[PDB]
């Protein structure tokens, strides 16, 4: 599974 709200954004 992937998080469409976190994964496509830049890693913190």
């Amino acid at each position, epitope marked *: *599974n*992937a*998080n*469409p*709200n976190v*994964d*496509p*954004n*830049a890693n913190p």
Partner: antibody
Amino acid sequence: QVQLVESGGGVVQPGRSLRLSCAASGFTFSVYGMHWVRQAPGKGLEWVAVIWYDGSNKIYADSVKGRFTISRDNSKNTLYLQMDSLSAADTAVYYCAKIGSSSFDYWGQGTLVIVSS
Amino acid sequence: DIVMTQTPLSSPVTLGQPASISCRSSQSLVHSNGITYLSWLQQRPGQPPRLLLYEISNRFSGVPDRFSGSGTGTDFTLKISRVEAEDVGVYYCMQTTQFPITFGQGTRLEIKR
């Protein structure tokens, strides 16, 4: 003052191509993934594609796999969508959307692409 | 794909009266991190959609407190305590827990005056 401005809409013959743009301001474009959403006249919203913050990974809807290509130019803060092999089923108002607040927090104004002979 | 079912298609509500819009998902929208990734969108006539609620009940920037969110798991409800004139348009629910991002059909809110 977060504003998304699209451009590139018009009329196109069946089978031909068209490229859409999406200018992003008010936020750091390089650190947010982007989406493309479309809405047929009088119909609902349908997701099209997503692109990572750096373009490293890209996911497409099954109805546009093999024909649409999502891309971005972080040096211009612009999101692109190349539409090849267009069909009358692809006639819709196309939106770009920014990721934010665990949703699509900001949208463009929408641009209309019509496929007609 | 997660199927979003919105009911009804049209809601005739009187000015100042409360209104509620239901949204149902084919699966649980609770992610592996324990967060329900359901959002409510407002599309005024001739305008793009704007975000009203994210994660069921959290209000977005500049969203009036009359808009409310409830429901958890697979059933969700967007509530307006006082229907105002700016509230005309279609309302969409959206999931972002899976990557085939799916929307609802929409609920048109018609205002009686």
